[PDB]
Design a protein around this ligand. Sequence first.
Ligand code: FPP
Ligand code: ZN
Lengths: 323, 407
Amino acid sequence: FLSLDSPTYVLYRDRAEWADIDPVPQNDGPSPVVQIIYSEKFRDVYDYFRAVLQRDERSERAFKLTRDAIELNAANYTVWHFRRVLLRSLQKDLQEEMNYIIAIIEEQPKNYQVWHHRRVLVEWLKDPSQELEFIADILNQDAKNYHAWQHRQWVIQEFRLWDNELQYVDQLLKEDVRNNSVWNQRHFVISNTTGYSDRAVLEREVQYTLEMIKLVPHNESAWNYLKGILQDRGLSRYPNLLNQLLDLQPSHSSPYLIAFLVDIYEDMLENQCDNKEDILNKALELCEILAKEKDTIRKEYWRYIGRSLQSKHSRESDIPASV
Amino acid sequence: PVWSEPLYSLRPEHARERLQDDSVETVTSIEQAKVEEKIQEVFSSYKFNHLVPRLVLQREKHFHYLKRGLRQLTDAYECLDASRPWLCYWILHSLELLDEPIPQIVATDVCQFLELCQSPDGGFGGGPGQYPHLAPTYAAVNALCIIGTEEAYNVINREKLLQYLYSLKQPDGSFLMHVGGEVDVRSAYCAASVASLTNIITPDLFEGTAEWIARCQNWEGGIGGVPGMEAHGGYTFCGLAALVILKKERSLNLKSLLQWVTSRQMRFEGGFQGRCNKLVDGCYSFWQAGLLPLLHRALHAQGDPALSMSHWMFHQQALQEYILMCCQCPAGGLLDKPGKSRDFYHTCYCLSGLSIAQHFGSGAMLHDVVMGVPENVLQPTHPVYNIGPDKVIQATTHFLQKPVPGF
Ligand SMILES: CC(C)=CCC/C(C)=C/CC/C(C)=C/COP(=O)(O)OP(=O)(O)O
Ligand SMILES: [Zn+2]
């Protein structure tokens, strides 16, 4: 009945329906550490929650009490556990509970317990019909919310709702092409449907990716995605790629383009290829430009790559010491 | 020469490291531009005010903040009422990094308090009478080990701890966070951290666990919370660190992981982000940057000849610069970024990060970089447990004298 933020809110120790129960004070010990000076409202609710929990009172009034305990601290997993016990024991309408969790997630979307609670409900009801649309709304206010994407993946995987997700991905990439969560969702959808071995699909993706790089050269997400889908089979396996990236050298240069070229040469030198020394020099040169000019923040990484490539791909590498 | 600026973030060239949005504006570029502007003001604040830049870690200010919070917290920490052992750990570890003695009066109170948090069924709760959970169990154990006394060690009920870990183990190798709770890679690391320290690892406890963690590595090189999810620093640390513990680091593509972590250091701010295309945050000074000592030790185990013998594979200077200039609260405690308010979580991991960027350790090779005044130097920390390296050795040695529960 009575809300926590209500002007006529009364403490539980001043409530009649609650006079039979003695509250249980927190057992903090003789002299406590990290002791929190709780407010009046907080301690009152939790003193009464400690009581119903202690007595394992599975009552309607206790169910209403968990709502307040949660509102005071949504991160209290014990209270969420007891509330789920209550949901089953009291045979509560779970669609009502879904309406409740929808509300709570809206206000505290970055909380672990609230998302797991929703999962459990969907699991109990075997009903995903509200899920994609609810998640989309959270993603409308924070498009990168980790728990929201995680829930969306779980729902889509369990209930096989793959049909429309790629389209959803395209809309959000439209809206913000720098959204790395959406580039991850794209890899999630594709690799669980068609996969990346279908040469037509791998074709469509790379054209799309280079196209986005053309538009936003300095967007790291597109570069990482391009690397992510081609490196499995080996980058040197795609000889046209190296040249087409060198086409954007003057007009669409970036520290990420230079890094990619190093990765292509890197795989080239692993799969013995043409000019197994001219390609090395090209790479060490670009490594030094990165470590000293274009990407100095990673100087320790870029001087490591050069020292790894010289450690195995110099002309003197497999040549014995006495020679 | 005398025109030369000793601080990497103040150098003229550094100005070219600002974001290039390519005239295409999105929510990501706008938000990153805002932080960059806020960080710029902090950097060129010395030129404007016409003063000589000096980098001081406010040791005494932080100490007072910590000394107090260890005893009493305002109602602002009501949202952490289910994370009280974390509060112990964050504070105790922060004190340890600043090198402050822990009075045996405090040590015994922390002990007694954590004992009240410990479940009869094993593990620790977020506070007295709360159900056991793997996050505060990791926090409790870590805290008790920092204290390192016989009293502290004996608090832990090893039989029940192991029973508890088992009751959370899933068929696919993962663990629940608590009974009826969620699953992600944090549980793996928490389970592994406490099990290895207290010497309770049975042959089958982590069966399939390393493979499940390996499934968490994605196309980015990094590790996500569960298989299929975006790579994230905190999860990546948990996974890698868990794998180092199980001695299964090699299950991962360490090459792509290294590329991913080193790309998480911001070219302008010098601090780290949690994931690609998001904002810098001082607490990632540990989760992200702390991966490099792990990767360094893993690659060295393979016999990687190219590894540096003096530096970690990130800009150690620039990370220290970011923390000291941008993450310090004048009143004490540390923070996410300028504009944010201090908390004990960011105090813990900014200083853990700073310690990491200050100390290099690879067997017999030991090199330091202590930016600003030399009193900024902190105690080193173990890259796996994030407690003092001496406390890790001290604790493992103690618990190895105990048999693994069940002979
Ligand atoms: C031992 C242990 C418990 C480790 C976990 C460490 C850790 C940092 C986990 C990250 C949790 C999370 C969902 C962050 C995303 O929040 P956000 O989107 O508000 O932050 P972000 O934008 O920097 O990803
Ligand atoms: Zn943070």
